[PDB]
């Protein structure tokens, strides 16, 4: 019999998600119940997996395909049949997949590098210009950087986040829509007139996001600057299989999708990485020494970023402990037996609980809570399906190399140009908005006074 | 019998200042009544002068000395015996004057230049980074620039105004204090319990300004870097006459004074200059041609800024029409007859209405409202005391060379790097906060794509 956490009569397990930190709650449940537990709500069931033993079966694409979790079905209200919220079998998924993969080729990535540097230099200059005793609001500045990077690299659009003391309106609306989706999970009678205003606000925030997408497309339309970026591929690329391009409706959904997926989780990653660095000073020193050794020019080169091996290890270890898109959903393609123990029928759902997978002591050893970048000295040594911060198979993250190149560049420059102080002895507090991010994480920087 | 505008019974002329635009109202009164009129309030009188023939007499320092207008007396509540709000006969006036005069020498200006460029480059980069069809909020960005320039050049303190979409809190508090003082002029029964909230906010706004001053001082003493800026002279300079340095209390007053006087009127100047340029495209062409011909390096030099003659003529003509500190006050040192017609007793007050002086048709010709920089092409041709945007005599603006160097550099770079469009066909609306500035002035820039 499958373990199951505590129930609330007719509501079954649903009230367990009536919390501001649902993923962290599910992790605690996994600690108590083990590698698999059933989670029921009125009218639905899923099974949360936490061991590599079971997740390696879940990642077999002949047996399971990507499912849209409840969260993703609600995000689909604004993300449509964009890549993240489309089913594998929808024509627009494989079309967009084939059309946009070229936007993340090696040659594309080399092409984005200069614009990544543009935004990174803005970050470095902001911090150089701070006065004595001033501090840095880490997740806020990381969100400024990542949003601006996807906007510029992807769409030749400048959000100019470093010119604002508040979040860009896009961010404010995105955040409000995302945690409104985190709210809709735990609810009942959605057509209740009580939520007429919540729907009005949801539609308002969606309109804000779509108005900006309108601007991006119109600006490209009127331009004559010869762009060869993500939007270029959206507007002109043809799917080799069907021979078709994307239509205008799908393009709008892809823009929204990439603006959100293309920064939020990267800002979390950078925030967690800097957190672990300041909490582990020997690791910080080792990373700083690499940055100084490798980044010998005022502008980092593409090749130099690729040579930041230890900074890459730091980022992977941060993703191990706190993968910022912490779960993904699967359904059974056919009847099948999971783990030689659990019979599933076609259509049965699974949730992969990534932070728990990443704490599987049979894979990582007993010290799973310790921050040790050296675990990733040779990424080849990690068993298959043991480390899954970017999902699985053909439905894995399309932007993984983009995110990692950006984060490595930025963290490298940060470690080259400043020493960091955990001046408040910050107590980790992880805010959940579907994605994960340190809340209230602040540091002080002291410039090493190296020119740009 | 001296002319006098309309009266309001026992309140006399006081309610004429109960307007958001008191200087402009006084200008209209001057147009109606001529070169001199009496202005009375309960328990006080002054005489407003508008002609060069009477103002030249008023500028005779053997007969008249600087007076603190009622406005300056209320500003003195936070500016103390700083240079702007001290009487000539107060020890701390000549003392501070002697100590700080060398901080505005050519040797000093050459010293500030690099930091002026620092902030100007931030301005240019902001505008380069705007998207298609976005516009510029002119007085807002000019205030960002001028505040940051005096902060950095004067005090090695970065307000980082370009990192904010709202004004720096210092600005918010400064403006509230200034317009309170303007609004406190027109008040009858100022101790009415209705104005208690206004008194409470005024004291809060003073506290904001003083905390910022305390931080500037604290930073300097803690700092280990070698500065030789305005603050260095305030803290270490000795007056050659008395042999004394400034005491701590006076230094605080000077910092407040220079932060306010050292940026507000310069932001107005730059805003009016750009307004007149976009309203006079042939003038804009001449100024842009000069900027292109002279500013041949990505980083302008001090020598190149001195070479921008036409840009200087533009700024002077903007100061002719809209001098941004639009009046100054004098008192009669002894009994004397003004203009062979108006007998004055010792202590009698005069107000010099600078915008009206600058429209004296007997001096400038009949076309006084037209924007023609060429009036300043042969500067000795301007009669004595006909052009007084920087006040008079030993109580003249100590920062004139700073303001003009900054404004010439910045306007030069603006004209080098962008074409400008008056896309809204903006209707001049002058906001008064004691000082004058266009309100709601917006333009679009098109980059000339010249690298920095
Ligand atoms: O939605 C579900 O089915 C279950 C909770 C659940 C289980 N059973 C239920 C029954 C009724 C109601 C809810 C449940 N959700 C989760 O466990 C979960 F962890 F919250 C999630 F929903 F899985 C998730 F991890 F938060 C998440 F939403 F998928 C996610 F990973 F954070 C994510 F939001 F999708 C993302 F992938 F992280 C994302 F990046 F934020 C994103 F939403 F995909 C996105 F990229 F931003 C977007 F795609 F752009 F939105
Ligand atoms: O204050 C007065 O005595 C008369 C009005 C008046 C006349 N009679 C009165 C009787 C009762 C009450 C009021 C009156 N004031 C004006 O006519 C006037 F034009 F508003 C003004 F006050 F002179 C003035 F122009 F605003 C001003 F005071 F000169 C001025 F603008 F404040 C200024 F001095 F020019 C100034 F330089 F701009 C400034 F505002 F003071 C200033 F420079 F910004 C500053 F605030 F002093 C500084 F920034 F701190 F330096
Ligand atoms: C640290 C950074 C990132 C993390 C942790 C992350 C994580 C993930 C995960 C877990 C998935 C699979 C979701 C699922 O199966 O339901 C995914 C898919 C995706 N990611 Fe990311 N991602 C990151 C950065 C980015 C960036 C920078 C982009 C774009 C520039 C992006 C675009 C996408 C897209 C489009 C998909 C959907 C792919 C498809 O199904 O066809 N991601 N990502
Ligand atoms: C366009 C810009 C400026 C204008 C139009 C302007 C105008 C004036 C005027 C009219 C006065 C005389 C006031 C009176 O008689 O009551 C004055 C005095 C003064 N100005 Fe300015 N000014 C400008 C810029 C600056 C700057 C940049 C600074 C400082 C960096 C500054 C500092 C002062 C000081 C300290 C005084 C008082 C001088 C004294 O009495 O000893 N000004 N200014």
Tab-separated table of C-alpha atoms in Angstrom, chain A residues 29-223:
chain	number	residue	atom	x	y	z
A	29	UNK	CA	6.095	14.968	3.900
A	30	UNK	CA	8.632	13.132	1.705
A	31	UNK	CA	11.094	13.084	4.626
A	32	UNK	CA	8.401	11.429	6.759
A	33	UNK	CA	6.914	9.024	4.194
A	34	UNK	CA	9.818	8.140	1.878
A	35	UNK	CA	10.326	7.703	-1.848
A	36	UNK	CA	6.647	7.675	-2.841
A	37	UNK	CA	3.393	9.006	-1.452
A	38	UNK	CA	-0.120	9.377	-2.741
A	39	UNK	CA	-1.660	12.831	-2.688
A	40	UNK	CA	-5.419	13.104	-3.138
A	41	UNK	CA	-7.758	16.033	-3.581
A	42	UNK	CA	-11.460	15.874	-4.323
A	43	UNK	CA	-11.643	14.474	-7.865
A	44	UNK	CA	-7.921	13.887	-8.375
A	45	UNK	CA	-4.840	11.967	-7.351
A	46	UNK	CA	-1.124	12.134	-7.996
A	47	UNK	CA	1.935	10.343	-6.641
A	48	UNK	CA	4.958	12.270	-5.409
A	49	UNK	CA	8.304	10.626	-6.201
A	50	UNK	CA	11.509	11.434	-4.314
A	51	UNK	CA	14.006	8.621	-5.051
A	52	UNK	CA	16.302	8.186	-7.998
A	53	UNK	CA	15.256	4.491	-8.003
A	54	UNK	CA	11.688	5.451	-8.965
A	55	UNK	CA	12.400	8.685	-10.844
A	56	UNK	CA	14.653	6.854	-13.325
A	57	UNK	CA	11.528	4.896	-14.346
A	58	UNK	CA	9.400	8.046	-14.494
A	59	UNK	CA	11.964	9.578	-16.874
A	60	UNK	CA	11.590	6.715	-19.375
A	61	UNK	CA	9.901	8.561	-22.240
A	62	UNK	CA	8.462	5.339	-23.685
A	63	UNK	CA	6.466	4.917	-20.438
A	64	UNK	CA	5.667	8.486	-19.310
A	65	UNK	CA	5.155	11.845	-21.028
A	66	UNK	CA	4.974	15.389	-19.605
A	67	UNK	CA	1.712	16.201	-17.827
A	68	UNK	CA	0.315	19.680	-17.199
A	69	UNK	CA	0.006	19.892	-13.422
A	70	UNK	CA	-2.862	21.919	-11.992
A	71	UNK	CA	-0.461	24.867	-11.662
A	72	UNK	CA	0.510	24.659	-15.349
A	73	UNK	CA	-3.134	24.414	-16.469
A	74	UNK	CA	-3.797	27.711	-14.696
A	75	UNK	CA	-0.603	29.298	-16.119
A	76	UNK	CA	-1.856	28.180	-19.534
A	77	UNK	CA	-4.609	30.818	-19.140
A	78	UNK	CA	-1.900	33.332	-20.153
A	79	UNK	CA	0.905	31.116	-21.563
A	80	UNK	CA	-1.384	29.224	-23.988
A	81	UNK	CA	0.232	26.570	-26.183
A	82	UNK	CA	3.678	28.078	-25.716
A	83	UNK	CA	6.446	25.513	-25.192
A	84	UNK	CA	6.156	25.257	-21.403
A	85	UNK	CA	2.379	24.780	-21.174
A	86	UNK	CA	1.743	22.738	-24.335
A	87	UNK	CA	1.143	18.989	-24.462
A	88	UNK	CA	3.740	16.965	-26.386
A	89	UNK	CA	1.050	15.817	-28.814
A	90	UNK	CA	-0.135	19.354	-29.732
A	91	UNK	CA	1.119	20.308	-33.210
A	92	UNK	CA	2.403	23.630	-31.883
A	93	UNK	CA	4.698	21.898	-29.373
A	94	UNK	CA	6.859	19.994	-31.862
A	95	UNK	CA	6.719	22.909	-34.346
A	96	UNK	CA	7.955	25.453	-31.789
A	97	UNK	CA	10.452	22.914	-30.385
A	98	UNK	CA	12.063	22.438	-33.813
A	99	UNK	CA	11.849	26.128	-34.753
A	100	UNK	CA	13.323	27.505	-31.521
A	101	UNK	CA	16.007	24.938	-30.690
A	102	UNK	CA	18.290	26.718	-33.230
A	103	UNK	CA	18.024	29.844	-31.042
A	104	UNK	CA	20.050	27.946	-28.414
A	105	UNK	CA	22.739	26.496	-30.692
A	106	UNK	CA	26.407	27.148	-29.966
A	107	UNK	CA	26.460	29.856	-32.615
A	108	UNK	CA	23.308	31.471	-31.169
A	109	UNK	CA	24.848	31.443	-27.676
A	110	UNK	CA	28.024	33.124	-28.911
A	111	UNK	CA	25.688	35.667	-30.473
A	112	UNK	CA	23.945	36.456	-27.174
A	113	UNK	CA	27.170	36.898	-25.215
A	114	UNK	CA	27.754	40.621	-25.863
A	115	UNK	CA	24.221	41.565	-24.786
A	116	UNK	CA	24.566	39.391	-21.654
A	117	UNK	CA	27.707	41.404	-20.889
A	118	UNK	CA	25.777	44.656	-21.472
A	119	UNK	CA	23.373	43.809	-18.626
A	120	UNK	CA	26.051	42.277	-16.346
A	121	UNK	CA	28.089	45.480	-16.624
A	122	UNK	CA	24.994	47.467	-15.567
A	123	UNK	CA	24.775	45.264	-12.450
A	124	UNK	CA	28.459	45.642	-11.656
A	125	UNK	CA	28.248	49.432	-12.152
A	126	UNK	CA	25.221	49.679	-9.866
A	127	UNK	CA	27.160	47.951	-7.082
A	128	UNK	CA	30.369	49.934	-7.721
A	129	UNK	CA	28.297	53.095	-7.273
A	130	UNK	CA	26.878	52.209	-3.865
A	131	UNK	CA	27.920	54.433	-0.970
A	132	UNK	CA	29.531	53.309	2.271
A	133	UNK	CA	27.389	51.079	4.495
A	134	UNK	CA	24.773	50.567	1.728
A	135	UNK	CA	23.624	47.020	0.997
A	136	UNK	CA	22.377	44.937	-1.911
A	137	UNK	CA	18.877	43.459	-2.182
A	138	UNK	CA	19.973	40.235	-3.827
A	139	UNK	CA	16.898	38.595	-5.396
A	140	UNK	CA	15.623	42.002	-6.487
A	141	UNK	CA	18.872	42.833	-8.349
A	142	UNK	CA	19.119	39.303	-9.747
A	143	UNK	CA	15.598	39.701	-11.159
A	144	UNK	CA	16.589	43.041	-12.687
A	145	UNK	CA	19.522	41.334	-14.392
A	146	UNK	CA	17.753	38.208	-15.620
A	147	UNK	CA	14.650	39.934	-16.948
A	148	UNK	CA	16.782	42.466	-18.749
A	149	UNK	CA	19.016	39.746	-20.198
A	150	UNK	CA	16.184	37.679	-21.697
A	151	UNK	CA	14.513	40.861	-22.976
A	152	UNK	CA	17.636	42.168	-24.705
A	153	UNK	CA	19.227	38.928	-25.907
A	154	UNK	CA	15.876	37.406	-26.863
A	155	UNK	CA	13.828	40.313	-28.216
A	156	UNK	CA	16.139	43.330	-28.537
A	157	UNK	CA	13.921	45.004	-25.949
A	158	UNK	CA	15.236	46.920	-22.925
A	159	UNK	CA	13.212	46.590	-19.739
A	160	UNK	CA	15.731	49.019	-18.181
A	161	UNK	CA	15.250	47.430	-14.780
A	162	UNK	CA	18.355	49.084	-13.338
A	163	UNK	CA	16.684	52.481	-13.966
A	164	UNK	CA	13.879	51.596	-11.505
A	165	UNK	CA	13.857	51.297	-7.698
A	166	UNK	CA	10.607	49.299	-8.016
A	167	UNK	CA	10.021	46.160	-10.084
A	168	UNK	CA	9.197	46.651	-13.774
A	169	UNK	CA	5.374	46.548	-14.152
A	170	UNK	CA	5.720	43.255	-16.068
A	171	UNK	CA	7.340	41.690	-12.969
A	172	UNK	CA	4.677	43.027	-10.584
A	173	UNK	CA	1.897	41.563	-12.771
A	174	UNK	CA	3.796	38.292	-13.380
A	175	UNK	CA	4.378	37.758	-9.646
A	176	UNK	CA	0.722	38.506	-8.861
A	177	UNK	CA	-0.466	36.082	-11.580
A	178	UNK	CA	1.950	33.321	-10.510
A	179	UNK	CA	0.961	33.284	-6.823
A	180	UNK	CA	-2.713	33.636	-7.867
A	181	UNK	CA	-2.051	30.300	-9.585
A	182	UNK	CA	-0.369	29.044	-6.373
A	183	UNK	CA	-3.667	30.117	-4.718
A	184	UNK	CA	-6.101	28.508	-7.199
A	185	UNK	CA	-4.519	25.123	-6.364
A	186	UNK	CA	-6.109	25.179	-2.900
A	187	UNK	CA	-9.654	26.349	-3.713
A	188	UNK	CA	-13.231	25.194	-4.393
A	189	UNK	CA	-16.212	26.483	-6.412
A	190	UNK	CA	-14.050	28.687	-8.717
A	191	UNK	CA	-17.194	30.203	-10.331
A	192	UNK	CA	-18.201	31.696	-6.943
A	193	UNK	CA	-18.937	35.463	-7.349
A	194	UNK	CA	-16.461	35.966	-4.444
A	195	UNK	CA	-13.613	35.527	-6.956
A	196	UNK	CA	-15.072	37.909	-9.585
A	197	UNK	CA	-12.474	40.509	-8.519
A	198	UNK	CA	-9.671	37.901	-8.437
A	199	UNK	CA	-10.530	37.068	-12.031
A	200	UNK	CA	-10.691	40.798	-12.850
A	201	UNK	CA	-7.203	41.279	-11.331
A	202	UNK	CA	-5.909	38.151	-13.073
A	203	UNK	CA	-7.210	39.442	-16.420
A	204	UNK	CA	-5.710	42.869	-15.624
A	205	UNK	CA	-2.258	41.385	-14.934
A	206	UNK	CA	-2.540	39.259	-18.097
A	207	UNK	CA	-3.368	42.382	-20.128
A	208	UNK	CA	-0.264	44.124	-18.707
A	209	UNK	CA	1.881	41.181	-19.855
A	210	UNK	CA	0.209	41.062	-23.296
A	211	UNK	CA	0.496	44.851	-23.785
A	212	UNK	CA	4.261	44.544	-23.346
A	213	UNK	CA	4.354	41.630	-25.806
A	214	UNK	CA	2.426	43.931	-28.181
A	215	UNK	CA	5.221	46.512	-27.861
A	216	UNK	CA	7.991	43.974	-28.492
A	217	UNK	CA	6.357	42.739	-31.715
A	218	UNK	CA	5.505	46.243	-32.979
A	219	UNK	CA	9.057	47.489	-32.263
A	220	UNK	CA	10.537	44.597	-34.260
A	221	UNK	CA	7.970	45.279	-37.006
A	222	UNK	CA	9.038	48.926	-37.369
A	223	UNK	CA	12.775	48.211	-36.911
